[PDB]
């Protein structure tokens, strides 16, 4: 009924009160060794499950090193959600971050 | 002294929040120190 | 990968209503039909068919055990990924009369 | 990982089981003797087949085999409740603060309301407003008590709705470390005051003292002639240290918990209680044990002989007494001698289940109860949860080598033909997986078994060079199920020159004692083989040290 | 203590919307649209094409089947819209990858045209066969109801020639026939409908 | 007897009213004996026990009355009964599974499973299974799963297979609405047999295929026919093999003797010979593919033309017309990008195409001969450029077919590249790039039995 | 025993096959007659710009349902 | 060295048993079906 | 002493063997 | 590394349990190719290369009626240097039930052996 809907609209109002908007983001512009070791992790676990690839892979069977080839050329469709400890967050992309 | 700390937690009727890593591993949730302190979200390009 | 994914790595079934583990059960079907997971303390048995005018069961809640009792309700279980030792921990604490009400939240 | 899990667990709520185990488990147990003749488990006793399948039977509840049933619980009907040996520290104190005549606490109903109404505030994230309740203090009439607590309770209704309209709290309350500090200090002082007092002070109608022992007997002390004079001029207008039957404590406590619901509503709840599940007396007494599934209770062996289980020996004496506390009931039903054993039965039946849970509270070395397998470095909670043993790991003696990389570990071929890794087949790695599956589990760049789409495994150990080549050409053949169009075939390859492996010296103090290496398989060798320059980080010398190579 | 626990037993088996006896043909109307919200996966092979990737995995194995959560038989859908996990509408919506797997879960609203029979409905289907045991029907070319003997008016007999029916008209009767609906079944993979021919 | 045994079962029929179920497991056991178990029921009482239940129906739907229905399902050998009993037991199942549409879950398990038995044995099963598919149109979904389970194992006998593959194509012949899960079920399980002989080249899995793939080629000729290909279901047959070709049978590395089916289908009409080859270009020249398929499809294309007896003599031309068009669409871009910092493995797509173009000319060259003896777009200027181009494609193609080229172009006067193949003295990811260039998909069949059919559609090494 | 263990090959009721939870968000609204036509006539052309083509004719058994010759 | 028991499933083989390293047992055609842990247990 | 400790790392003490355990017991 | 190992069958009896299990083969089955490693009366030919898995004695009991064997249980393959047949003290007609066997495990200087 709507006791799901009254249970749903509270969450999407809660989930909208925690996204810090893009003109007001206040964390680092860097990829702080923990995004980088996990973005390369999860993307390598997508190419092993037939994700669409967007680079001239050059006989590189190793599924981890394929993601590095797309990391240094910025073809990754990921978005990092960084939880500030009250529950608020800043959905950084992978383009707008700056690698080490 | 495990069940020493249980009786004063049972009678607290306490919602454990599962965020300290000695508690978070017991339920098997991803450890939130480092690579579990953020979540990775995928952007599907087309509609 | 060293305390879940290679120690036990089980996908148990957890009732979302009561939030327990050991009160679930994969049911016994009529052999034409297909078995499914059901919660016991969320369901009340078919002898309690007590009746806006009537509460006739739509048969999508009736499920029968390995004996022949029939129960109504007790669905909305799902599959979570606990370590298996957690299932052992409940029964060691259920013997102390103490339950663990797992708030399995994404509903 | 081809089977993704959906729902997850976020937060574990504790709680006490009710007398509604009857709804979940209709497998109550009467028979103490289980292993009958011809090697069978009895139906109705402790090894019932409704508590999971046991020795290649069907489960009477699941209907599945030995290893597909989760297991089932059961309840043992005690004739009377018996108080739970965990919670005896928090009912003996609540018995000593009690009076059987006023059925309130010995402290005054404005002193008791004063502490409880602070504890309503301290289940919200506010401590400043908690010490402002002592700013309202103004042969005392009923007009000063209909009106004082009318103002205190007004202030808390002001303060919460102030804070809840603010962001200082939520509906589900705020609970931080310092608020937890300010909550235990009151309760440890609340249980300091109510434990010692002269009389009930609604009146002169008070009760005499109580007295315990090692979690078995409760002794209601008799009265001195100082106080016979009091109750006969106020309550109307044998010897000491008598035994009390346990079910009269249940008549004491439940008449307290419905008189003082409200103060004990906040003692036993630290989050703000939403669903107002009321504090009752089944939180402290036990009408029923639960019975764990048969899978959790299996025998051990010595030599060749499979010996007696340890749980059931504790749970036999409780159930043999359950008949003998019931068989003896019919003799007193037939109208002395028989009181002295029925009352001996109630003392031992509490000491029965006290032996069942905590072995330090009952009569060379006794049997470990369920707490005793949980409290040390040995036991469960520190050993099988913090310290889990793993799959896919090896250890050896180490050896030096300068001729490899410093970030490498030289691996024997014994280890290179054992440790597998799932490689999902795709359009690019099919060529290094054909030459995997053509080799098989004896030629080093090979594979031990392949996983189909459905979840089934296909071994590769027994086959020959033709059938593997037949099957090494069928990897990118999709199958005609609707569920498994995505799940490609995981080949389990051997570890190769490009995988990464962990190393672990056993006294692991600093984090550089468990690092990550790359794998270089060396033929014609027998030990793990490491570079010299990575002995600075372990301080392991190459003369008899073991390094656990996790993968 | 037998009021406060009956608030979740009757209220759940109080099935929400009935079937109106509309259209002035006597027949009751059972085709009905309900908006819902799912919670589905999305495989990494469909991670460029999230439209097809939800239709093919969770919706296409659900059409023309019963569903125990809506109460009807799913006939179709239109309006599969992935809820974005970014509370910014836009075309580049984002979903959340799970930690332990590369599979992402997300919410989706859709409008399922369920077919909803209950007792007390008025239904008509083409007579499939008939014997002195039942009369098998084809409700809307695909659904089968079967009024058995002990709910038929017992005036009406059966002549055998595999034979044909004897009513008070005495006719081997054609397809189109009205009846009233007994307990709809849920048991097998085939959805059995059951009814009565009492008037 | 018949005046006594007919009311005999009325006792156990009325034993549901007494709610004891006493003589149930005497009657229902007695019918559940097999054919050898000598106290089983005869044909006379079988006419007796059936007709009591066909008119007294409401009183079997019980938890104890369920058992005797199962014994009717477990009644074996009913397809051999006398026709006064056969048509009485065929009629019973139509009124058992129609009063209760829950038994068609249960009965049809037997009906699919009996399809091991031959075609003149099993005329009556599909007579009923067509009638209940016509009854319940939402009953395809679980007979979908039954056909997957009861396909025979590979190491069963041939009579269990080629009768079954005929007792399965019989189903599609009256129900094309299933269609796709038929060809997917066979072709996936043909490769289960088919690939297990190229590793061996004992005779067991030889003739298992020459009975199946003979029968499939004959059963498809009944559908690749102008009574169907222009107005019937031959479009539904060809377009379900084409989307079965490029999904299943192309990513099988090294499978002999299955691509002859698409060879045998796409050879009957000029519509199909010019739909498949304009389809196989669409794979082999798009950017939407991983490069390892674009190698194989052109490799599949090159040994297609010169190993096909039945094409038109202008269908040969347009393939090579386009295949020379692409190599001269290639000239502007990547023929001065050679000498940059890279490798010759960048152009894997190029050399495999020029290999496949040389295999056209090797065994089809006199078709290219015009009236005078000139060539299509001057092949002593097209090839004679790419002989001496800046790739040396004489070196990077296959050694065998380039040896065939100069040992034909010597005796044909199109190229003179034997000097340059000799000019490879000191200069001469590779091992799996040999293996595609030697994979000619249309080698002759070693199996002695099916080439008798293909002695008419195929050019040999001669 | 085998038949309890070949349930694991027959069932396959995964999370790729079924959604986790379906909740009705609003109460069901009884549609009219002509829009059931106007839905189903436009529902069929969905994946018709593989498998699902045994079910396409099941979807094209929905095609005949109101205007063919029953 | 073989010790006899019931036949195997999978609709492949009736094969007999032999042991694997220290916690389970297989057959010669590899098929192992559940219910085999030797009742693995302690000492003293 | 580094043999059985090398079969299992159990180089602790059962008792405290220290002065600080007096108020601890 | 020499290594000995008692084998006794009088450890599962009373003082006066009648003699049940005997060394040597029996009947009622085929002893399955054990005469590669074993001699006629439940003993090995001394000097025989054993590994794990190989039988080392064939004790035949009489309650179960079965030619049972026991396994050399270690990871390093060995040989046999001696097999004694230990006498008995009680009387002069009770059969042999106690057999000691002296193994041998050669140990070359492998990589890691400390000098």
Domain membership of residue J56 (yes or no) is yes
The parent domain of residue E37 ranges over 31-115
Q: Does J14 touch chain D (CB under 8 A)?
A: no
Q: Are C100 and B14 in contact (CB under 8 A)?
A: no
| E strands in E46-133 | 73-77, 81-82, 94-97, 104-115, 122-130
Going D534 to D539 to D545 to D550, the CA torsion angle's sign is negative
* Closest C-alpha among F131, F452, F409 to residue F260: F452
Asked if D211 and D219 touch (Cβ cutoff 8 Å), the reply is yes
Q: Would you state the structure tokens that stand for residue F251, as one six-digit string? A: 């990513």
* Number of domains present in the structure of chain F: 1
* CB proximity list for G12: less than 8 A, separation 6 or greater: D454, D481, D483, D484
For this experimental structure, what is the resolution in angstroms?
Answer: 3.7
Query: Considering only residues 164 to 193 of chain E, which have any Cβ-Cβ distance to chain F shorter than 8 Å?
Result: 185, 187-192
Domain extent, residue C29, equals 1-104
> CA J74, CA D525: separation in Å to the nearest integer?
22
Q: Enumerate residues 6+ apart whose C-beta is below 8 A from C74.
A: C15, C38, C39, C40, C41, C42, C43, C61, C63
Cβ within 8 Å, pair D486-A49: yes
* Residue from the list G4, G16, G51 with its beta carbon closest to the beta carbon of D65: G4
Integer Cα distance of D266 and D276 in angstroms:
11
D427 secondary structure, DSSP code: S
Torsion angle, alpha carbons of D391, D397, D398, D399, to 10: -150
Give the gyration radius of chain A's Cα atoms: 17
Best F16, F97, F99, F177 member to test E by mutation, with max E CBs in 10 Å, is F99
Number of Cβ within 10 Å of residue F425's Cβ equals 6
Contact F181 G58 (CB under 8 A): no
Query: Which pair of structure tokens corresponds to residue E139?
Result: 């409700």
Give the CATH number, domain containing residue J7.
2.40.50.150
Residues of A in contact with B45 (CB under 8 A): 77
Q: Please check whether residue J39 is in contact with residue J72, taking contact to mean a CB–CB distance below 8 angstroms.
A: no
**Residue C4 distance to chain E (closest CA, Å):** 10
Q: How far apart are CA J85 and CA J22, in angstroms?
A: 13
- Number of other CB atoms surrounding residue F54 within 10 Å: 16
In sequence order, the 6+-apart residues with CB closer than 8 A to the CB of E109 are E35, E36, E37, E38, E79, E80, E81, E83, G25
| CA distance linking residue C61 with residue D312, whole number of Å | 36
Q: How far is CA D381 from the centre of its chain?
A: 9
The technique by which this structure was obtained is cryo-EM
The bridge status of strand C98-103 relative to strand D11-16 is: antiparallel
Residue with tokens 């310290």: D387
Instruction: Tell me the C-alpha distance between D282 and D269, whole Å.
Output: 16
DSSP state of D154: H
Q: How far is D368 from chain H (nearest CA, A)?
A: 14
DSSP A53: P
CB pairs under 8 A between D and I: 6
Query: Which tokens go with F212?
Result: 């199946």
The residue among D477, D449, D435 whose CA lies nearest residue F195 is D477
Q: Is residue J114 part of a domain?
A: no
Q: What is the CATH number of the domain that holds E111?
A: 3.30.1490.120
- The strand ranges marked E within A9-96 are 78-83, 89-93
Q: Are residues F322 and F281 in contact, defined by beta-carbon separation less than 8 angstroms? A: yes
Binding-site members of H for Zn(2+) are 8, 13, 27, 31
Could you tell me how many CB contacts below 8 A there are between chain A and chain B? Answer: 38
Q: Which residue of C has its CA nearest to D392?
A: C6
Buried-exposed string C25-63: b where 16+ CB fall within 10 A, e elsewhere: bbbbeeebbbbbbbbbbbbbbeeeeeeeeebeebeebbb
Token pair of J54, please? Answer: 């190989």
Kindly list the residues from chain D whose CB atom is less than 8 angstroms away from the CB atom of residue F199: 465-467, 469-470
Counting Cα atoms < 13 Å in the Cβ hemisphere of F320 gives: 29
Name the residue among D82, D46, D37 with its Cα closest to residue D248.
D82
Nearest-Cα residue of chain F relative to residue C34: F105
Please determine, looking at this structure, whether the domain spanning D419-495 carries the CATH number 3.30.1490.180: yes
Distance (Å, whole) CA D345 – CA D322: 9
Chains touching chain D at 3 or more Cβ pairs under 8 angstroms?
A, B, C, E, F, G, H, I, J
Handedness of CA E71, E76, E79, E85 (dihedral sign): positive
Q: Exposure of F286 by Cβ count < 10 A (0-12 exposed, 13-18 middle, 19+ buried)?
A: exposed
Question: Preceding residues of all breaks in chain E (C to N beyond 2.5 angstroms)?
Answer: 88, 161
| D65 vs D50: CA distance, rounded Å | 12
Mutate to test the interface with D, among E1, E43, E55, E103 (most CBs of D within 10 A): E103
Neighbours of E13 (CB within 10 A): 16
Distance from CA of B29 to the nearest CA of C (A): 8
Q: What is Dmax (Cα atoms) for chain G?
A: 55
State the CATH architecture for D392-418+496-551: Beta Barrel (2.40)
User: CB atoms < 10 A from the CB of I12, how many?
Assistant: 6
Distances in Å between the Cα of J61 and the Cα atoms of D469, E95, F169, J68 are 50, 70, 62, 8
Bridge partners, residue A81, by sequence: A91, B39
**F2-13 and F24-31 are packed helices; what angle lies between their axes, rounded to 10 degrees?**
120
* Domain span holding position A62: 1-100
Instruction: Give H-chain residues touching D56 at CB under 8 angstroms.
Output: 35
d(CA D264, CA F206): 84
Report whether E99 contacts E141 (CB < 8 A). Answer: no
| Of the partner residues D10, D87, D375, the one whose CB lies closest to the CB of residue B18 | D10
Closest CA of chain C from G47, distance in Å: 30
The closest alpha carbon to B39, from E97, J13, J6, belongs to E97
Burial of J26 by CB count in 10 Å (0-12 exposed, 13-18 middle, 19+ buried)? middle
Residue numbers in A near B42 (CB within 8 A)? 77-79
Q: Is D62 flagged in the annotation as binding?
A: yes
Cross-chain Cβ contact F185/D480 below 8 Å: yes
Fill in the DSSP letter of residue F143: H
Alpha carbon separation from J44 to A97, D55, D221, F2, J106 (Å, rounded): 75, 37, 79, 76, 19
Opening angle at CA A87, ends A86 and A90, nearest 5: 115
What is the CATH number for C49?
3.90.1800.10
Calculate the alpha carbon distances from C92 to C21, D51, E85, G10 in Å: 13, 15, 40, 34
Calculate how close chain G gets to E72, using CA atoms only, in Å.
10
Secondary structure E strands in D292-419:
301-302, 305-306, 393-397, 408-411
Enumerate the β-bridge partners of residue E107: E39
CA pair distance B35, C72, nearest whole angstrom: 44
Taking the C-alpha atoms of residue D138 and residue E89, their distance in angstroms, rounded to an integer, is 62
If phi over 0 gives left and psi between -120 and 50 gives alpha, with beta otherwise, what is residue B14? beta
Domain membership of residue J29 as a residue range: 1-108
CA-CA distance, D220 to J70, in Å (whole number)? 66
Half-sphere exposure of residue D66: CA atoms within 13 angstroms, side-chain side: 13
Select from D87, D19, D24 the least CA-distant residue to D287: D19
Q: How many interface pairs between B and E have CB atoms less than 8 angstroms apart?
A: 43
Q: What one-character DSSP code corresponds to residue A30?
A: B
Taking each helix axis from N to C terminus, what angle separates F180-194 and F166-174, rounded to the nearest 10 degrees?
A: 160
Of J34, J111, F180, nearest to D527 by C-alpha is J111
Q: Which residue of A has its CA nearest to B32?
A: A83
The Cα–Cα gap between A50 and D206 comes to 79
J14 occurs within a structural domain: yes
CA-based nearest residue to G52, from F242, D452, E63, F252:
E63
Collapse the DSSP code of D296 into the 3-class scheme (helix H, G, I; strand E, B; otherwise coil) and give the result: helix
Is D200 annotated as a binding-site member?
Answer: yes
Cross-chain residue pair D65–G17, CB shorter than 8 Å: no
Tell me if residue E46 falls in helix, strand or coil. Answer: helix
Instruction: Give the chain E residue nearest B43 (alpha carbons).
Output: E94
What CA–CA distances, in Å, run from F112 to D482, D516, F145, F151, G57? 20, 56, 10, 9, 22
Q: Would the CB atoms of H42 and D300 count as touching at under 8 Å?
A: yes
- Shortest distance between the Cα of B39 and any Cα of chain D, in A, equals 15
Work out the minimum CA distance from D511 to partner chain B, whole angstroms: 15
Could you say which of B34, B35, B43 has the minimum Cβ distance to residue A78? B43
Contacts of F43 (CB under 8 A, 6+ apart): F81, F82, F85
- In contact, D72 and D60? CB cutoff 8 Å: no
Q: Is the dihedral of CA F281, F283, F289, F290 positive or negative?
A: negative
Q: Do the two chains D and G touch, given a threshold of 8 Å on CB pairs and at least 3 pairs?
A: yes
Put simply, the chain D residues between 291 and 320 with a CB less than 8 A from any chain C CB are 292-293, 296
């Amino acid at each position: 009924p709507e006791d799901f809907q009254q249970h749903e609209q509270i969450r999407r109002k809660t989930l909208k009160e925690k996204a810090i908007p893009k003109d007001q983001r206040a964390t680092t512009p860097y990829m702080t060794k923990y995004e980088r070791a996990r973005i390369l992790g999860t993307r390598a676990l997508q190419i092993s499950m037939n994700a669409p690839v967007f680079v001239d892979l050059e006989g590189e069977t190793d599924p981890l090193r394929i993601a590095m080839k797309e990391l240094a050329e910025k073809k990754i469709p990921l978005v990092i959600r960084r939880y500030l400890p009250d529950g608020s967050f800043e959905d950084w992309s992978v383009e707008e971050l700056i690698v080490d | 002294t495990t069940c020493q700390f249980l009786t004063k937690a049972v009678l607290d009727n306490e919602r454990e929040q599962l965020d300290s890593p000695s508690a978070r591993i017991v339920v098997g949730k991803l450890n939130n120190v480092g690579t579990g302190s953020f979540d990775v979200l995928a952007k599907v390009p087309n509609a | 990968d060293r305390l879940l994914n290679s120690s036990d790595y089980t996908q148990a079934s957890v009732c979302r209503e009561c939030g327990s583990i050991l009160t679930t059960q994969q049911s016994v079907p009529r052999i034409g039909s297909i078995s499914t997971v059901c919660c016991r303390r969320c369901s009340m048995r078919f002898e309690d068919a007590k009746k806006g005018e009537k509460i006739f069961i739509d048969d999508s809640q009736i499920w029968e055990d390995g004996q022949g009792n029939k129960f109504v309700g007790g669905n909305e279980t799902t599959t979570v990924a606990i370590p298996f030792v957690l299932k052992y921990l409940d029964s060691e604490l259920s013997a102390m009369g103490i339950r663990l009400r797992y708030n399995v939240e994404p509903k | 990982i081809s089977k993704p899990v959906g729902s997850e667990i976020t937060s574990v709520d504790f709680g006490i089981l009710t007398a509604k185990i009857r709804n979940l488990s209709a497998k109550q147990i009467t028979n103490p003797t289980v292993l009958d003749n011809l090697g069978h488990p009895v139906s109705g006793g402790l090894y019932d087949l409704a508590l999971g399948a046991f020795l290649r039977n069907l489960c009477s509840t699941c209907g599945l085999d030995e290893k597909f049933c989760p297991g089932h619980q059961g309840h043992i009907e005690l004739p009377v409740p018996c108080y739970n040996p965990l919670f005896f520290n928090q009912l003996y104190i609540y018995l000593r603060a009690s009076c059987l005549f006023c059925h309130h606490f010995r402290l005054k109903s404005v002193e008791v309301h004063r502490y409880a109404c602070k504890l309503r505030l301290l289940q919200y994230g506010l401590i400043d407003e908690s010490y402002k309740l002592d700013e309202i203090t103004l042969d005392i009439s009923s007009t000063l008590l209909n009106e004082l607590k009318s103002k205190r309770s007004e202030y808390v209704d002001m303060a919460i709705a102030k804070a809840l309209s603010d962001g200082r709290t939520t509906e589900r309350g705020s609970f931080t470390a310092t608020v937890n500090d300010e909550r235990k200090k009151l309760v440890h002082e609340f249980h300091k005051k109510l434990l010692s007092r002269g009389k009930c002070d609604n009146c002169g109608m008070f009760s005499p003292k109580f007295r315990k022992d090692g979690f078995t007997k409760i002794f209601e002390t008799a009265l001195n002639e100082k106080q016979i004079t009091n109750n006969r001029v106020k309550g109307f207008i044998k010897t000491g240290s008598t035994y009390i039957l346990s079910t009269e404590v249940k008549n004491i406590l439940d008449t307290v918990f419905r008189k003082e619901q409200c103060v004990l509503q906040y003692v036993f709840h630290s989050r703000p209680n939403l669903s107002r599940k009321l504090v009752k007396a089944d939180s402290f007494f036990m009408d029923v044990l639960v019975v764990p599934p048969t899978r959790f209770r299996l025998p051990s062996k010595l030599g060749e002989e499979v010996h007696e289980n340890s749980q059931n020996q504790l749970l036999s004496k409780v159930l043999t007494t359950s008949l003998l506390i019931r068989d003896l009931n019919d003799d007193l039903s037939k109208l002395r001698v028989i009181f002295s054993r029925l009352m001996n039965a109630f003392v031992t039946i509490q000491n029965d289940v006290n032996a069942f849970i905590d072995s330090t509270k009952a009569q060379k070395v006794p049997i470990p109860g369920v707490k005793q397998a949980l409290e040390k470095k040995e036991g469960l909670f520190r050993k099988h949860m913090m310290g889990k043993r793993v799959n896919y790991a090896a250890r050896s003696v180490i050896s030096p080598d300068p001729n490899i990389e410093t970030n490498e570990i030289g691996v024997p071929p014994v280890f290179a033909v054992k440790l597998t890794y799932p490689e999902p087949v795709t359009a690019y790695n099919i060529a290094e997986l054909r030459q995997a599956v053509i080799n098989g589990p004896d030629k080093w760049p090979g594979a031990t078994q392949i996983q189909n789409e459905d979840g089934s495994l296909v071994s590769l150990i027994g086959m020959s060079v033709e059938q593997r080549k037949a099957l090494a050409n069928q990897l990118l053949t999709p199958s005609s199920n609707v569920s498994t169009h995505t799940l490609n075939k995981k080949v389990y390859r051997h570890i190769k020159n490009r995988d990464v492996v962990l190393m672990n010296r056993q006294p692991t103090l600093h984090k550089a004692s468990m690092m990550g290496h790359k794998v270089r398989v060396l033929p014609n060798e027998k030990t793990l083989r490491l570079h010299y320059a990575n002995t600075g980080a372990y301080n392991a010398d190459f003369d008899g040290d073991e390094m656990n190579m996790h993968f | 203590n037998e009021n406060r626990e009956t608030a979740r037993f009757i209220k759940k088996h109080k099935k929400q919307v009935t079937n109106p006896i509309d259209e002035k043909n006597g027949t009751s109307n059972c085709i009905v649209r309900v908006p819902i919200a799912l919670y589905v996966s999305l495989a990494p092979m469909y991670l460029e094409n999230p439209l097809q990737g939800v239709m093919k995995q969770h919706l296409n194995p659900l059409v023309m089947k019963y569903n125990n959560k809506v109460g009807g038989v799913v006939l179709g859908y239109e309006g599969l819209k992935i809820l974005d996990a970014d509370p910014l509408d836009t075309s580049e919506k984002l979903i959340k990858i799970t930690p332990d797997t590369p599979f992402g879960f997300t919410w989706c609203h859709v409008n399922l045209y369920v077919w909803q029979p209950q007792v007390g409905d008025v239904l008509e289907g083409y007579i499939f066969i008939q014997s002195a045991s039942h009369i098998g029907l084809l409700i809307h070319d695909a659904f089968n109801a079967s009024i058995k003997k002990n709910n038929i008016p017992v005036d009406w007999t059966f002549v055998h020639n595999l034979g044909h029916w004897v009513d008070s008209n005495g006719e081997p009767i054609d397809g189109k026939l009205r009846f009233t609906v007994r307990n709809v079944h849920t048991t097998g993979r085939v959805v059995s409908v059951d009814g009565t021919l009492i008037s | 007897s018949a005046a006594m045994y007919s009311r005999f079962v009325k006792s156990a029929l009325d034993d549901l009213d007494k709610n004891d179920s006493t003589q149930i497991g005497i009657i229902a056991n007695q019918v559940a004996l097999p054919s050898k178990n000598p106290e089983r029921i005869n044909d006379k009482n079988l006419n007796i026990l059936l007709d009591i239940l066909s008119s007294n129906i409401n009183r079997i739907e019980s938890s104890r009355g369920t058992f005797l229905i199962q014994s009717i399902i477990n009644f074996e050998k009913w397809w051999e009964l006398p026709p006064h009993t056969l048509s009485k037991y065929i009629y019973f199942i139509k009124i058992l599974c129609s009063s209760i549409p829950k038994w068609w879950q249960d009965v049809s398990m037997i009906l699919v499973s009996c399809f091991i038995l031959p075609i003149k044995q099993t005329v009556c099963h599909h007579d009923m299974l067509k009638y209940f598919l016509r009854m319940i149109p939402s009953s395809m979904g679980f007979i979908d799963t039954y056909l997957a389970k009861f396909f025979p194992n590979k190491n069963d006998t041939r009579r269990k297979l080629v009768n079954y593959t005929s007792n399965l194509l019989k189903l599609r012949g009256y129900c094309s609405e299933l269609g796709f899960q038929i060809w997917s079920l066979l072709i996936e399980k043909i490769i289960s047999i088919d690939v297990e002989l190229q590793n061996e080249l004992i005779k067991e899995l030889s003739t298992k295929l020459d009975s199946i793939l003979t029968l499939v080629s004959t059963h498809v000729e009944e559908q690749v026919t102008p009574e169907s290909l222009e107005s019937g279901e031959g479009v539904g047959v060809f377009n379900t093999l084409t989307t079965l070709f490029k999904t299943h049978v192309l990513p099988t590395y090294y499978t002999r003797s299955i691509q002859y089916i698409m060879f045998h289908v796409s050879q009957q009409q000029l519509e199909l010979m010019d739909s498949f080859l304009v389809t196989l270009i669409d794979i082999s020249f798009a950017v939407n593919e991983a490069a390892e398929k674009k190698i194989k499809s052109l490799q599949y294309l090159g040994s297609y033309i010169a190993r096909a007896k039945k094409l038109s003599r202008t269908q040969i031309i347009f393939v090579a017309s386009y295949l020379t068009s692409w190599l001269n669409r290639y000239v502007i871009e990547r023929e001065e990008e050679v000498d940059q910092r890279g490798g010759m493995e960048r152009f894997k797509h190029f050399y495999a195409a020029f290999q496949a173009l040389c295999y056209i000319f090797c065994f089809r060259h006199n078709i290219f001969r015009d009236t005078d003896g000139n060539w299509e777009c001057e092949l002593d200027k097209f090839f004679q450029r790419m002989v001496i181009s800046k790739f040396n494609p004489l070196k990077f193609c296959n050694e065998n077919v380039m040896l065939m080229f100069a040992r034909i172009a010597q005796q044909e006067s199109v190229a003179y590249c034997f000097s340059i193949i000799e000019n490879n003295n000191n200069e001469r990811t590779r091992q799996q790039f040999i293996d595609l260039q030697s994979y000619f998909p249309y080698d002759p069949l070693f199996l002695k039995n099916y080439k008798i059919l293909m002695k008419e559609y195929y050019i040999e090494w001669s | 025993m085998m038949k309890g263990s070949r349930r694991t090959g027959n069932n396959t009721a995964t999370t790729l096959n079924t959604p986790v939870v379906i909740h009705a968000t609003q109460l069901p609204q009884h549609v009219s007659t002509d829009e059931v036509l106007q839905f189903l006539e436009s529902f069929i052309d969905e994946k018709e710009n593989t498998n699902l083509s045994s079910s396409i004719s099941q979807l094209k058994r929905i095609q005949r349902d109101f205007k063919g010759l029953p | 060295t073989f010790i006899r028991g019931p036949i195997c499933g999978t609709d492949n083989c009736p094969s007999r048993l032999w042991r694997i390293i220290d916690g389970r047992r297989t057959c010669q055609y590899g098929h192992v079906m559940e219910g085999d842990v030797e009742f693995n247990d302690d000492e003293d | 002493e580094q043999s059985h400790k090398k079969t299992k790392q159990a180089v602790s003490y059962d008792e405290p063997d220290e002065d600080e355990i007096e108020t601890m017991r | 590394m020499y290594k000995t190992e008692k084998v006794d069958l009088a450890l599962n009896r009373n003082r006066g349990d009648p003699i049940t299990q005997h060394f040597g083969f029996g009947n009622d089955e085929w002893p399955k190719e054990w005469l590669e490693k074993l001699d006629e009366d439940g003993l090995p030919y001394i000097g025989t290369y054993v590994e794990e898995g190989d039988p080392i004695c064939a004790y035949f009991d009489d309650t179960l009626n079965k030619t049972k064997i026991k396994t050399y249980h270690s990871s390093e393959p060995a040989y046999i240097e001696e097999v004694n047949l230990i006498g008995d003290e009680s009387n002069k007609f009770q059969e042999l039930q106690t057999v000691s066997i002296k193994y041998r495990i050669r140990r070359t200087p492998q990589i890691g052996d400390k000098f």
